[PDB]
């Protein structure tokens, strides 16, 4: 297999790999969201296509469950893996516990993956 460290430190202490990762986050399209009073609303800009693309695959506002939804801004590549494996956790949490999913419970398991991908070998 492929085993080596990817992200390593620097003489100033900052992370080269991680800062370039957040740079690609800003290079993506602008997405916004707010927490309403009794509701929640998400939104994201659409790069203007000329009389071509279908909006089914282009939609960047998804839903992890009936209780929780999500939006993303960045490289469209890594976004779909997180959406898929988070929905697995949503059904796995309902499979393990009869109670529904918690927004704070699902959120931490998501960001925890990106922490694993940073410190894992080869990821």
């Amino acid at each position: 297999s492929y085993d080596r460290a990817i992200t390593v430190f620097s003489p100033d202490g900052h992370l080269f790999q991680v800062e370039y990762a957040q740079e690609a986050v800003k290079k993506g399209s602008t997405a916004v969201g707010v927490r309403g009073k009794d509701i929640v609303v998400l939104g994201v800009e659409k790069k203007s296509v000329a009389k071509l693309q279908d909006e089914r695959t282009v939609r960047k506002i998804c839903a992890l469950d009936d209780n929780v939804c999500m939006a993303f801004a960045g490289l469209t590549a890594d976004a779909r893996i997180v959406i898929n494996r988070a929905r697995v956790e949503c059904q796995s949490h309902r499979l393990t516990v009869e109670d529904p999913v918690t927004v704070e419970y699902i959120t931490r398991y998501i960001a925890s993956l990106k922490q694993r991908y940073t410190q894992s070998n080869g990821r």
């Binding site: 839903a63 992890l64 469950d65 898929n84 929905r87 697995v88 949503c90 059904q91 796995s92 309902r94 499979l95």
Partner: peptide, 14 residues
């Protein structure tokens, strides 16, 4: 029953 139940719920979301 939870196996079939929860796994079908995952299908509708995708």
């Amino acid at each position: 029953a939870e196996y079939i139940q929860k796994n079908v719920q995952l299908y509708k979301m995708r």
